[PDB]
XYZ file of N, CA, C and O in Angstrom:
864
model
N 4.412 -16.213 -26.550
C 4.821 -15.776 -25.501
C 4.574 -16.512 -24.133
O 5.746 -16.499 -23.605
N 3.392 -17.097 -24.080
C 3.122 -17.904 -22.814
C 4.007 -19.270 -23.195
O 4.154 -20.036 -22.480
N 4.114 -19.745 -24.625
C 4.463 -20.951 -24.709
C 5.829 -21.217 -24.107
O 6.268 -22.110 -23.392
N 6.674 -19.981 -24.409
C 8.244 -20.143 -24.024
C 8.129 -19.932 -22.236
O 9.169 -20.441 -21.721
N 7.100 -19.389 -22.032
C 6.899 -19.092 -20.393
C 6.937 -20.322 -19.610
O 7.718 -20.904 -18.664
N 5.922 -21.134 -20.086
C 5.896 -22.536 -19.692
C 6.737 -23.320 -19.881
O 7.402 -24.001 -18.989
N 7.213 -23.650 -20.937
C 8.053 -24.447 -21.544
C 9.532 -24.178 -20.525
O 10.392 -25.187 -20.384
N 9.454 -23.048 -20.528
C 10.926 -22.442 -19.719
C 10.814 -22.864 -18.280
O 11.754 -23.016 -17.704
N 9.453 -22.719 -17.845
C 9.438 -23.050 -16.518
C 9.737 -24.604 -16.073
O 9.899 -25.262 -14.896
N 9.605 -25.356 -17.153
C 9.603 -27.125 -16.841
C 10.740 -27.225 -17.364
O 11.220 -28.501 -17.018
N 11.601 -26.315 -17.992
C 13.133 -26.655 -18.310
C 13.854 -26.795 -17.357
O 13.795 -25.953 -16.316
N 15.386 -27.131 -17.447
C 16.357 -27.108 -16.320
C 17.096 -25.710 -16.723
O 18.125 -25.979 -17.417
N 16.528 -24.919 -15.935
C 17.646 -23.551 -16.107
C 16.955 -22.471 -16.826
O 15.833 -22.481 -17.497
N 17.100 -21.242 -16.205
C 16.452 -20.023 -16.968
C 16.748 -19.672 -17.996
O 17.982 -19.709 -18.531
N 15.881 -19.224 -18.944
C 15.816 -19.097 -20.376
C 15.166 -17.757 -20.866
O 14.268 -17.238 -19.900
N 15.409 -16.913 -21.793
C 14.846 -15.775 -22.170
C 14.092 -16.044 -23.395
O 14.276 -17.025 -24.202
N 12.648 -14.873 -23.412
C 12.066 -15.193 -24.308
C 11.671 -13.988 -24.918
O 10.955 -13.198 -24.394
N 11.867 -13.432 -26.144
C 11.699 -12.202 -26.535
C 10.572 -12.130 -27.749
O 9.772 -13.188 -27.921
N 10.128 -10.919 -27.956
C 8.907 -10.729 -28.578
C 7.597 -11.128 -27.923
O 6.576 -11.342 -28.715
N 7.733 -11.322 -26.990
C 6.640 -11.671 -26.116
C 5.320 -10.597 -26.437
O 5.645 -9.427 -26.835
N 4.020 -10.820 -26.135
C 2.789 -10.079 -26.307
C 2.474 -9.551 -25.164
O 1.970 -9.916 -23.880
N 2.654 -8.037 -25.214
C 2.444 -7.183 -24.187
C 0.963 -7.031 -23.981
O 0.141 -6.103 -24.432
N 0.231 -8.190 -23.583
C -1.216 -8.280 -23.293
C -1.593 -8.923 -22.007
O -0.544 -8.827 -20.945
N -2.795 -9.345 -21.715
C -3.314 -9.765 -20.475
C -3.572 -11.435 -20.690
O -3.485 -12.087 -19.318
N -3.158 -12.184 -22.003
C -3.284 -13.473 -22.158
C -1.727 -13.899 -21.403
O -1.840 -14.938 -21.156
N -0.785 -12.870 -21.747
C 0.389 -13.400 -21.080
C 1.148 -13.046 -19.871
O 1.200 -14.023 -19.083
N 0.580 -11.531 -19.353
C 0.860 -11.538 -17.908
C 0.083 -12.589 -16.993
O 0.488 -12.583 -16.127
N -0.900 -13.070 -17.306
C -1.641 -13.828 -16.968
C -0.882 -15.324 -16.658
O -0.616 -15.860 -15.695
N -0.149 -15.526 -17.851
C 0.586 -16.935 -17.872
C 1.633 -16.617 -16.943
O 2.143 -17.603 -15.905
N 2.360 -15.458 -16.839
C 3.614 -15.021 -16.004
C 3.182 -15.349 -14.687
O 3.773 -15.802 -13.687
N 1.910 -14.578 -14.184
C 1.270 -14.352 -12.803
C 1.102 -15.902 -12.657
O 1.104 -16.174 -11.288
N 0.823 -17.014 -13.497
C 0.463 -18.189 -12.881
C 1.845 -18.995 -12.596
O 1.653 -19.571 -11.938
N 2.685 -18.777 -13.369
C 4.131 -19.406 -12.737
C 4.615 -18.787 -11.539
O 4.740 -19.408 -10.522
N 4.673 -17.281 -11.236
C 5.153 -16.942 -10.084
C 4.715 -17.277 -9.122
O 4.881 -17.230 -8.064
N 3.202 -17.304 -9.191
C 2.087 -18.166 -8.290
C 2.769 -19.603 -7.598
O 2.875 -19.378 -6.600
N 3.296 -20.212 -8.612
C 3.504 -21.550 -7.869
C 5.192 -21.251 -7.267
O 5.638 -22.085 -6.265
N 5.886 -20.315 -7.928
C 7.020 -19.886 -7.403
C 7.946 -19.783 -8.386
O 9.372 -19.255 -8.177
N 7.668 -19.578 -9.896
C 8.667 -19.398 -10.689
C 9.259 -18.296 -10.674
O 8.532 -17.335 -10.418
N 10.560 -17.836 -11.182
C 11.070 -16.457 -11.332
C 11.296 -16.102 -12.942
O 11.995 -16.595 -13.344
N 10.284 -15.146 -12.966
C 10.466 -14.662 -14.216
C 10.633 -13.017 -14.455
O 10.250 -12.731 -13.279
N 11.368 -12.639 -15.689
C 11.525 -11.148 -15.644
C 11.168 -10.484 -16.950
O 12.186 -11.058 -17.821
N 10.276 -9.616 -17.174
C 10.102 -9.406 -18.511
C 10.953 -7.957 -18.876
O 11.701 -7.427 -17.766
N 10.773 -7.595 -19.983
C 11.604 -6.221 -20.319
C 11.028 -4.867 -20.065
O 9.946 -4.918 -19.647
N 11.445 -3.794 -20.406
C 10.722 -2.275 -20.347
C 9.772 -2.514 -20.953
O 8.687 -1.378 -20.902
N 9.423 -3.044 -22.110
C 8.298 -3.129 -22.938
C 7.211 -4.289 -22.785
O 6.318 -4.555 -23.505
N 8.039 -5.536 -21.851
C 7.232 -6.842 -22.007
C 7.213 -7.485 -22.891
O 6.358 -8.074 -23.249
N 8.332 -7.293 -23.799
C 8.316 -8.137 -24.997
C 9.457 -9.125 -24.633
O 9.838 -9.987 -25.573
N 10.062 -9.506 -23.644
C 11.077 -10.251 -23.239
C 11.133 -10.628 -21.858
O 11.482 -9.640 -21.215
N 11.284 -11.738 -21.648
C 11.323 -12.557 -20.304
C 12.315 -13.333 -20.060
O 12.553 -14.154 -21.197
N 12.518 -13.562 -19.009
C 13.640 -14.755 -18.671
C 13.105 -15.549 -17.510
O 13.151 -15.097 -16.278
N 12.685 -16.616 -17.859
C 12.048 -17.481 -16.957
C 12.833 -18.485 -16.453
O 13.650 -19.355 -17.223
N 12.966 -18.713 -14.888
C 13.914 -19.876 -14.309
C 13.243 -21.072 -14.260
O 11.969 -21.229 -13.850
N 13.746 -22.128 -15.200
C 13.679 -23.356 -15.137
C 13.110 -24.085 -13.854
O 14.236 -24.480 -13.092
N 12.003 -24.226 -13.654
C 11.807 -24.922 -12.529
C 12.101 -26.284 -12.412
O 12.399 -27.056 -11.333
N 12.552 -26.808 -13.449
C 13.171 -28.442 -13.822
C 12.101 -29.473 -13.870
O 12.696 -30.539 -14.603
N 11.184 -28.875 -13.443
C 10.133 -30.003 -13.810
C 8.512 -29.425 -13.964
O 8.622 -28.475 -14.687
N 7.509 -29.800 -13.707
C 6.189 -29.119 -14.051
C 5.866 -28.022 -13.238
O 6.433 -28.104 -12.162
N 5.202 -27.276 -13.418
C 4.985 -26.014 -12.897
C 4.373 -26.717 -11.309
O 2.949 -27.015 -11.301
N 5.351 -26.781 -10.419
C 5.022 -27.525 -9.157
C 4.492 -26.417 -8.107
O 5.203 -25.567 -7.500
N 3.404 -26.657 -7.403
C 2.811 -25.849 -6.198
C 1.966 -26.714 -5.389
O 0.860 -27.007 -5.945
N 2.439 -26.793 -4.298
C 1.492 -27.463 -3.285
C 1.121 -26.367 -1.966
O 1.944 -26.187 -0.997
N 0.111 -26.057 -2.288
C -0.752 -25.361 -1.332
C -2.113 -24.903 -1.661
O -2.441 -23.632 -1.340
N -2.563 -25.455 -2.293
C -4.173 -25.174 -3.040
C -3.860 -23.837 -3.597
O -4.755 -22.671 -3.363
N -3.238 -23.396 -4.405
C -2.930 -22.053 -5.133
C -4.092 -22.065 -6.047
O -4.236 -22.933 -6.917
N -4.766 -20.898 -6.060
C -5.616 -20.489 -7.345
C -5.198 -19.369 -7.982
O -4.954 -18.465 -7.784
N -5.352 -19.860 -9.433
C -5.030 -18.510 -10.282
C -5.823 -17.994 -11.231
O -7.130 -18.526 -11.039
N -5.908 -16.887 -11.984
C -6.709 -16.114 -12.495
C -6.037 -15.965 -13.919
O -5.288 -15.254 -14.311
N -6.570 -16.676 -15.212
C -6.412 -16.425 -16.405
C -7.240 -15.662 -16.922
O -6.955 -15.495 -18.426
N -8.049 -14.943 -16.258
C -8.859 -13.907 -17.158
C -9.498 -14.633 -18.551
O -9.565 -15.531 -18.863
N -9.455 -13.559 -19.458
C -9.879 -13.888 -20.700
C -8.770 -14.310 -21.689
O -8.581 -13.474 -22.508
N -8.035 -14.992 -21.202
C -6.720 -15.305 -21.963
C -7.170 -16.542 -22.960
O -7.228 -16.225 -23.985
N -6.883 -17.796 -22.230
C -7.323 -18.903 -23.174
C -6.063 -19.581 -23.822
O -6.135 -20.563 -24.400
N -5.086 -18.772 -23.975
C -3.890 -19.114 -24.452
C -3.031 -19.387 -23.264
O -1.785 -19.971 -23.727
N -3.199 -19.435 -22.237
C -2.409 -19.386 -21.034
C -3.042 -20.383 -20.058
O -2.671 -21.091 -19.111
N -4.259 -20.514 -19.977
C -5.408 -21.266 -19.113
C -5.348 -22.652 -19.487
O -5.447 -23.461 -18.476
N -5.210 -22.956 -20.672
C -5.350 -24.375 -21.211
C -3.953 -25.223 -20.693
O -3.494 -26.127 -20.222
N -2.918 -24.543 -21.380
C -1.053 -25.166 -21.259
C -0.993 -24.906 -19.677
O -0.353 -25.913 -19.352
N -1.213 -23.912 -18.912
C -0.796 -23.709 -17.575
C -1.725 -24.806 -16.824
O -1.291 -25.409 -15.731
N -3.144 -25.206 -17.410
C -3.637 -26.214 -16.455
C -3.300 -27.360 -16.459
O -3.049 -28.143 -15.625
N -2.635 -28.139 -17.677
C -2.138 -29.158 -17.798
C -0.672 -29.313 -17.285
O -0.301 -30.326 -16.749
N 0.184 -28.260 -17.472
C 1.307 -28.322 -16.877
C 1.576 -28.851 -15.475
O 2.423 -29.316 -14.875
N 0.626 -28.183 -14.768
C 0.689 -28.585 -13.412
C 0.107 -29.967 -12.918
O 0.470 -30.341 -12.002
N -0.487 -30.389 -14.117
C -1.115 -31.704 -13.654
C -0.208 -32.683 -13.417
O -0.425 -33.941 -13.102
N 1.429 -32.097 -13.568
C 2.259 -33.400 -13.381
C 2.502 -33.409 -12.132
O 2.313 -32.309 -11.124
N 3.514 -34.066 -11.789
C 4.002 -34.472 -10.297
C 2.666 -34.491 -9.261
O 1.839 -35.199 -9.273
N 2.510 -33.436 -8.278
C 1.737 -33.504 -7.694
C 1.644 -31.929 -7.004
O 2.468 -31.173 -6.249
N 0.195 -31.312 -7.545
C 0.375 -29.883 -7.505
C -1.006 -29.475 -6.966
O -1.985 -29.792 -7.683
N -1.543 -28.838 -5.769
C -2.735 -28.200 -5.892
C -3.173 -27.009 -6.328
O -2.587 -26.109 -5.588
N -3.641 -26.622 -7.357
C -4.267 -25.288 -7.836
C -5.713 -25.367 -8.311
O -6.120 -26.036 -9.082
N -6.270 -24.183 -7.957
C -7.558 -23.950 -8.568
C -7.704 -22.731 -9.418
O -7.236 -21.542 -8.890
N -7.617 -23.166 -10.661
C -7.808 -22.162 -11.635
C -9.372 -21.263 -11.710
O -10.252 -21.673 -11.164
N -9.103 -20.200 -12.252
C -10.162 -19.444 -12.249
C -9.883 -18.087 -13.549
O -8.703 -17.986 -14.039
N -11.145 -17.584 -14.100
C -10.687 -16.511 -15.082
C -11.735 -15.592 -14.982
O -12.517 -15.343 -14.346
N -11.970 -14.823 -16.328
C -12.825 -13.529 -16.289
C -14.376 -14.152 -16.605
O -14.595 -15.296 -16.431
N -15.175 -13.051 -16.528
C -16.542 -13.491 -16.783
C -16.840 -14.443 -18.052
O -17.579 -15.092 -18.045
N -16.376 -13.863 -19.061
C -16.496 -14.728 -20.265
C -15.604 -15.717 -20.577
O -16.204 -17.013 -20.947
N -14.564 -16.061 -19.802
C -13.700 -17.363 -19.571
C -14.715 -18.402 -18.868
O -14.336 -19.478 -19.124
N -15.652 -17.799 -18.033
C -16.447 -18.963 -17.404
C -17.120 -19.675 -18.520
O -17.923 -20.884 -17.957
N -17.338 -19.724 -19.640
C -18.014 -20.143 -20.865
C -17.106 -20.825 -21.922
O -17.453 -20.987 -23.041
N -15.894 -20.915 -21.543
C -14.984 -21.480 -22.489
C -14.545 -23.024 -21.925
O -13.846 -23.378 -21.262
N -15.024 -24.068 -22.773
C -15.116 -25.306 -22.687
C -13.560 -25.571 -22.744
O -13.133 -25.362 -23.670
N -13.389 -26.638 -21.561
C -11.984 -27.311 -21.539
C -11.936 -28.722 -21.291
O -11.021 -28.947 -20.652
N -13.015 -29.176 -21.683
C -13.262 -30.615 -21.518
C -12.117 -31.379 -22.083
O -11.749 -32.180 -21.493
N -12.389 -31.254 -23.160
C -11.160 -32.135 -24.262
C -9.794 -32.289 -23.836
O -9.158 -33.146 -23.700
N -9.411 -31.058 -22.955
C -7.892 -30.846 -22.589
C -8.048 -31.471 -21.166
O -7.429 -32.357 -21.073
N -8.929 -31.214 -20.048
C -8.744 -31.978 -18.772
C -9.107 -33.361 -18.941
O -8.630 -33.925 -18.015
N -9.683 -33.958 -19.746
C -10.098 -35.108 -20.225
C -8.590 -35.956 -20.653
O -8.454 -36.964 -19.953
N -8.089 -35.422 -21.496
C -6.770 -36.209 -21.903
C -5.665 -36.113 -20.904
O -5.308 -37.272 -20.366
N -5.392 -35.041 -19.901
C -4.699 -35.045 -19.032
C -5.057 -35.972 -17.831
O -4.294 -36.996 -17.376
N -6.348 -36.000 -17.631
C -6.841 -36.754 -16.399
C -6.665 -38.139 -16.963
O -6.480 -38.956 -15.907
N -6.901 -38.439 -18.107
C -6.788 -40.027 -18.692
C -5.312 -40.650 -18.608
O -5.045 -41.411 -18.161
N -4.397 -39.406 -18.550
C -2.899 -39.812 -18.589
C -2.312 -40.011 -16.741
O -1.422 -40.307 -16.249
N -3.518 -39.330 -16.034
C -3.155 -39.720 -14.649
C -3.488 -38.387 -14.025
O -3.051 -38.339 -12.659
N -3.753 -37.449 -14.602
C -3.902 -36.113 -13.838
C -5.225 -35.883 -12.830
O -6.213 -36.739 -13.052
N -5.225 -35.240 -11.984
C -6.188 -34.862 -10.914
C -6.675 -33.589 -11.091
O -6.129 -32.637 -10.321
N -7.872 -33.336 -11.678
C -8.736 -32.142 -11.852
C -10.004 -32.370 -11.430
O -10.512 -33.304 -11.116
N -10.526 -31.135 -11.174
C -11.928 -30.926 -10.755
C -12.811 -29.757 -11.481
O -11.891 -28.862 -11.677
N -13.904 -29.752 -10.881
C -14.645 -28.594 -11.698
C -15.539 -27.655 -10.409
O -16.384 -28.422 -9.676
N -14.813 -26.560 -10.059
C -15.314 -26.084 -8.960
C -16.557 -25.161 -9.166
O -17.267 -25.004 -7.833
N -16.915 -25.035 -10.286
C -18.322 -24.265 -10.450
C -19.055 -25.341 -11.807
O -19.822 -25.698 -11.496
N -18.584 -25.100 -12.916
C -19.255 -25.754 -14.033
C -18.094 -27.056 -14.685
O -16.756 -26.533 -14.752
N -18.783 -27.894 -15.519
C -17.907 -28.667 -16.137
C -17.379 -27.980 -17.292
O -18.065 -27.698 -18.005
N -15.890 -28.228 -17.612
C -15.327 -27.994 -18.879
C -15.267 -26.323 -18.824
O -15.588 -25.680 -19.890
N -14.770 -25.914 -17.551
C -14.914 -24.097 -17.518
C -13.654 -24.012 -16.803
O -13.102 -24.632 -15.954
N -13.136 -22.588 -16.763
C -12.098 -22.169 -16.042
C -11.614 -22.760 -14.664
O -10.713 -23.139 -14.048
N -12.810 -22.846 -13.542
C -12.920 -23.220 -12.379
C -12.249 -24.900 -12.609
O -13.187 -25.845 -12.555
N -11.034 -24.775 -12.316
C -10.278 -26.275 -12.186
C -9.269 -26.250 -11.098
O -8.584 -25.554 -11.042
N -9.772 -27.156 -10.240
C -8.639 -27.604 -9.150
C -7.826 -28.562 -9.527
O -8.497 -29.762 -9.573
N -6.425 -28.384 -9.760
C -5.761 -29.714 -10.141
C -5.090 -30.123 -8.872
O -5.050 -29.525 -7.993
N -4.678 -31.327 -8.894
C -3.502 -32.456 -7.934
C -2.608 -32.960 -8.552
O -2.202 -33.946 -7.588
N -2.049 -32.758 -10.006
C -0.748 -33.367 -10.186
C -1.389 -34.834 -10.595
O -2.566 -35.144 -10.471
N -0.318 -35.699 -10.835
C -0.671 -37.045 -11.084
C -0.356 -37.414 -12.513
O -0.433 -38.660 -12.760
N -0.078 -36.562 -13.212
C 0.085 -36.770 -14.763
C 1.205 -37.866 -14.735
O 2.282 -37.342 -14.897
N 0.803 -39.020 -15.168
C 1.885 -39.962 -15.517
C 2.192 -40.479 -17.090
O 3.185 -40.109 -17.583
N 0.970 -40.604 -17.796
C 0.945 -40.972 -19.112
C 0.010 -41.939 -19.515
O -0.947 -42.406 -18.887
N 0.438 -42.445 -20.769
C -0.669 -43.546 -21.279
C -1.368 -43.187 -22.599
O -1.221 -42.044 -22.850
N -1.903 -44.052 -23.071
C -2.699 -43.804 -24.265
C -3.763 -42.540 -23.995
O -4.686 -42.682 -23.018
N -3.850 -41.528 -24.738
C -4.805 -40.515 -24.669
C -5.364 -40.031 -26.043
O -4.916 -39.967 -26.837
N -6.664 -39.539 -25.856
C -7.525 -38.932 -27.035
C -7.762 -37.523 -26.805
O -8.824 -37.335 -25.558
N -7.356 -36.775 -27.503
C -7.659 -35.303 -27.336
C -8.489 -34.667 -28.444
O -7.927 -34.984 -29.707
N -9.189 -33.710 -28.407
C -9.941 -33.109 -29.491
C -9.098 -31.849 -29.919
O -8.811 -31.163 -28.950
N -9.034 -31.599 -31.203
C -8.154 -30.629 -31.964
C -8.975 -29.369 -31.712
O -8.388 -28.206 -31.436
N -10.112 -29.466 -32.033
C -10.982 -27.977 -31.932
C -11.075 -27.504 -30.945
O -10.292 -27.779 -29.751
N -11.228 -25.882 -30.925
C -11.153 -25.141 -29.521
C -9.765 -25.034 -29.352
O -9.056 -25.155 -28.208
N -9.048 -24.215 -30.471
C -7.532 -23.885 -30.521
C -6.820 -25.085 -29.906
O -7.062 -25.972 -29.382
N -5.387 -24.970 -30.219
C -4.671 -26.119 -29.971
C -4.171 -26.013 -28.674
O -3.106 -26.766 -28.207
N -4.493 -25.108 -27.807
C -4.003 -25.016 -26.242
C -4.392 -26.222 -25.618
O -3.695 -26.521 -24.437
N -5.230 -27.061 -25.991
C -5.613 -28.421 -25.611
C -4.362 -29.371 -25.457
O -4.008 -29.905 -24.778
N -4.121 -29.661 -27.012
C -3.120 -30.658 -27.501
C -1.732 -30.001 -26.945
O -0.770 -30.784 -26.999
N -1.612 -28.605 -27.114
C -0.420 -27.760 -26.901
C -0.051 -28.017 -25.183
O 1.165 -28.188 -25.058
N -0.990 -28.083 -24.624
C -0.780 -28.248 -23.052
C -0.306 -29.791 -22.561
O 0.625 -29.901 -22.185
N -0.898 -30.797 -23.383
C -0.487 -32.198 -22.968
C 0.755 -32.513 -23.880
O 1.677 -33.222 -23.524
N 1.064 -31.840 -24.776
C 2.223 -31.838 -25.771
C 3.478 -31.363 -24.834
O 4.539 -31.769 -25.411
N 3.303 -30.541 -23.946
C 4.543 -29.876 -23.107
C 4.385 -30.476 -21.819
O 5.399 -30.697 -21.238
N 2.985 -30.749 -21.640
C 2.999 -31.569 -19.979
C 3.258 -32.969 -19.990
O 3.802 -33.658 -19.345
N 2.553 -33.742 -21.276
C 2.697 -35.022 -21.402
C 4.328 -35.578 -21.271
O 5.049 -36.479 -20.714
N 5.401 -34.714 -22.178
C 6.755 -35.254 -22.296
C 7.260 -35.243 -21.159
O 8.187 -36.328 -20.765
N 6.986 -34.454 -20.023
C 7.711 -34.623 -18.762
C 7.143 -35.611 -17.782
O 7.539 -35.735 -16.856
N 5.851 -36.170 -18.433
C 5.309 -37.052 -17.543
C 6.105 -38.359 -17.575
O 6.353 -38.882 -18.663
N 6.245 -38.812 -16.330
C 7.004 -40.018 -16.116
C 6.699 -41.211 -16.840
O 7.708 -41.955 -17.436
N 5.589 -41.252 -17.266
C 5.094 -42.295 -17.987
C 4.923 -41.800 -19.747
O 4.360 -40.725 -20.108
N 5.226 -42.786 -20.544
C 4.984 -42.539 -22.180
C 3.331 -42.237 -22.190
O 2.571 -42.888 -22.297
N 3.409 -41.087 -22.880
C 1.869 -40.465 -23.217
C 1.482 -40.342 -24.762
O 2.560 -40.180 -25.279
N 0.705 -40.990 -25.169
C 0.359 -40.842 -26.619
C -1.195 -40.638 -26.578
O -2.467 -40.913 -26.195
N -1.273 -39.169 -27.103
C -2.579 -38.535 -27.235
C -2.855 -38.608 -28.593
O -1.918 -38.713 -29.395
N -4.020 -38.748 -28.964
C -4.856 -38.856 -30.172
C -5.441 -37.596 -30.541
O -5.887 -36.827 -29.570
N -5.864 -37.453 -31.873
C -6.531 -36.129 -32.279
C -8.078 -36.546 -32.584
O -8.500 -37.085 -33.774
N -9.035 -36.593 -31.579
C -10.290 -36.661 -31.761
C -11.096 -35.923 -32.792
O -10.951 -36.573 -34.108
N -11.226 -35.086 -32.491
C -11.973 -33.863 -33.624
C -10.975 -33.329 -34.305
O -9.715 -33.217 -34.270
N -11.504 -32.644 -35.459
C -10.538 -31.866 -36.713
C -9.823 -30.713 -35.647
O -10.117 -29.902 -35.269
N -8.226 -30.839 -35.803
C -7.515 -29.818 -35.003
C -8.212 -28.361 -35.824
O -8.150 -28.490 -37.032
N -7.738 -27.595 -35.151
C -7.960 -26.241 -35.253
C -6.862 -25.183 -35.549
O -6.780 -24.157 -36.035
N -5.684 -25.594 -35.135
C -4.449 -25.424 -35.051
C -3.179 -26.250 -35.503
O -2.234 -26.130 -35.032
N -3.817 -26.869 -36.370
C -2.870 -28.060 -37.105
C -1.429 -27.481 -37.163
O -0.655 -28.316 -36.496
N -1.095 -26.368 -37.736
C 0.251 -26.075 -38.059
C 0.782 -25.327 -36.827
O 2.017 -24.932 -36.589
N -0.277 -24.926 -35.779
C 0.332 -24.304 -34.644
C 0.879 -25.198 -33.560
O 1.334 -25.127 -32.604
N 0.426 -26.578 -33.803
C 0.939 -27.659 -32.906
C 2.191 -28.087 -33.446
O 2.974 -28.446 -32.289
N 2.740 -27.994 -34.531
C 3.923 -28.073 -35.006
C 4.910 -27.037 -34.078
O 5.787 -27.575 -33.723
N 4.237 -25.789 -33.713
C 5.199 -24.870 -33.241
C 5.540 -25.420 -31.670
O 6.420 -25.064 -31.397
N 4.565 -25.934 -31.346
C 4.272 -26.573 -29.911
C 5.743 -27.414 -29.817
O 6.501 -27.383 -28.733
N 5.966 -28.524 -30.492
C 6.882 -29.432 -30.576
C 8.136 -28.525 -30.990
O 9.165 -29.164 -30.543
N 8.056 -27.894 -31.888
C 9.123 -27.285 -32.479
C 9.878 -26.304 -31.348
O 11.212 -26.166 -31.211
N 9.032 -25.947 -30.476
C 9.302 -25.313 -29.047
C 10.141 -25.888 -28.194
O 11.316 -25.657 -27.536
N 9.630 -27.194 -28.176
C 9.849 -28.052 -27.010
C 11.304 -28.855 -27.450
O 12.168 -28.706 -26.648
N 11.226 -29.142 -28.763
C 12.899 -29.767 -29.134
C 13.684 -28.705 -29.054
O 14.908 -29.102 -28.780
N 13.506 -27.364 -29.277
C 14.437 -26.246 -29.168
C 15.165 -26.095 -27.925
O 16.274 -26.160 -27.706
N 13.949 -26.419 -26.899
C 14.591 -26.702 -25.568
C 15.504 -27.743 -25.256
O 16.434 -27.698 -24.453
N 14.700 -28.782 -25.505
C 15.781 -29.999 -25.462
C 14.676 -31.520 -25.266
O 15.762 -32.416 -25.316
N 13.701 -31.230 -25.408
C 12.800 -32.502 -25.503
C 11.981 -32.568 -27.054
O 11.504 -31.599 -27.404
N 11.823 -33.866 -27.399
C 11.076 -34.197 -28.744
C 10.200 -35.254 -28.536
O 10.558 -36.122 -27.528
N 9.116 -35.355 -29.116
C 7.994 -36.252 -29.327
C 7.928 -36.926 -30.723
O 8.531 -36.573 -31.460
N 7.146 -37.853 -30.569
C 6.888 -38.503 -31.773
C 5.598 -37.922 -32.609
O 4.501 -37.899 -31.950
N 5.745 -37.593 -33.648
C 4.793 -36.861 -34.741
C 4.164 -38.235 -35.570
O 4.571 -38.416 -36.419
N 2.757 -38.604 -34.991
C 2.227 -39.831 -36.057
C 1.554 -38.963 -36.985
O 1.944 -37.907 -37.307
N 0.557 -39.459 -37.783
C 0.143 -39.078 -38.927
C -0.743 -37.916 -38.692
O -1.884 -38.101 -39.099
N -0.371 -37.373 -38.007
C -1.293 -35.964 -37.471
C -2.540 -36.507 -36.698
O -3.516 -35.716 -36.408
N -2.586 -37.781 -36.242
C -3.907 -38.182 -35.648
C -3.240 -38.530 -34.376
O -4.366 -38.737 -33.358
N -2.073 -38.849 -33.958
C -1.680 -38.706 -32.305
C -0.534 -38.250 -31.989
O 0.434 -38.269 -32.957
N -0.391 -37.705 -30.732
C 1.064 -37.043 -30.333
C 1.488 -37.671 -29.430
O 1.293 -37.895 -28.143
N 2.465 -38.458 -29.905
C 2.903 -39.727 -28.677
C 4.451 -39.097 -28.451
O 5.170 -38.796 -28.836
N 4.190 -38.607 -27.004
C 5.244 -37.646 -26.173
C 5.951 -38.852 -25.149
O 5.309 -39.439 -24.502
N 7.235 -38.805 -25.196
C 8.350 -39.662 -24.621
C 8.047 -39.295 -23.208
O 8.761 -38.300 -22.987
N 7.351 -40.032 -22.177
C 7.247 -39.743 -20.965
C 8.659 -39.435 -20.346
O 9.497 -40.490 -20.572
N 8.972 -38.851 -19.404
C 9.958 -38.835 -18.398
C 10.909 -37.724 -18.936
O 12.359 -37.628 -18.584
N 10.483 -36.655 -19.921
C 11.497 -35.786 -20.711
C 11.543 -35.019 -19.554
O 11.231 -34.709 -18.216
N 12.218 -33.705 -19.792
C 12.674 -32.491 -19.419
C 13.546 -31.414 -19.862
O 14.575 -31.736 -20.469
N 12.600 -30.246 -20.470
C 13.190 -29.335 -21.175
C 14.616 -28.830 -20.487
O 14.423 -28.804 -19.495
N 15.472 -28.309 -21.394
C 16.839 -27.853 -20.773
C 16.765 -26.264 -21.197
O 16.083 -25.977 -22.332
N 17.561 -25.252 -20.459
C 17.700 -24.278 -20.932
C 18.214 -23.650 -22.130
O 19.486 -24.066 -22.029
N 17.611 -23.546 -23.221
C 18.148 -23.305 -24.636
C 19.033 -22.041 -24.394
O 20.091 -21.704 -25.252
N 18.651 -20.939 -23.790
C 19.377 -19.761 -23.514
C 18.489 -18.479 -24.231
O 17.208 -18.412 -23.603
N 18.689 -17.541 -24.922
C 17.822 -16.571 -25.594
C 16.882 -17.036 -26.697
O 17.595 -17.408 -27.794
N 15.845 -17.080 -26.458
C 14.835 -17.388 -27.901
C 13.906 -16.402 -27.951
O 13.423 -15.553 -27.055
N 13.456 -16.390 -29.324
C 12.523 -15.231 -29.747
C 11.138 -16.031 -30.003
O 10.985 -16.920 -30.709
N 10.288 -15.273 -29.223
C 8.886 -15.681 -28.965
C 8.590 -15.726 -30.767
O 8.409 -16.725 -31.480
N 7.894 -14.551 -31.167
C 7.522 -14.479 -32.303
C 6.296 -14.809 -32.719
O 5.173 -14.033 -32.409
């Protein structure tokens, strides 16, 4: 649901994502893009959205603060996406989200050139981003949902510089990460798939509007 939302936001041109999940983890993702200025529109059942491709990373210059609540599926991907270019945003979430480690993620993007901080605790929702994600060799932990690598996999490709993420700990969503690139490729961007040890994303990419896509 949120994968297509974000991927569509970094793509050039508005695209559609059907079979979206009518929940709070998604509405938060959508609320996250609209915050920067992205233009999305769901269906009567909130299962089909049309996201206007920002053309680049979720660009927002105004110290924007978002609330990903208890999602975790949109807080990690959206966190890294904005790390590109130059955007000032402070992330936040629900009471439980306050204890959702996000260091392995924030660490990789940061290594590529991203500018983030901890407004409350280290490796938690309170994250102030400032863009700067360019690229370079990176090492990301697989454990704790693939939202970590999934974030860099969509963010790093658009990063002006070539990013090479590796997989420190055992991936928790091994087959789910393939969907990340499978989603990106369908859009217009592809990356290098190492021996499941590193995700080399050709820097300088830019997803394009595929059209009508089914989330699933």
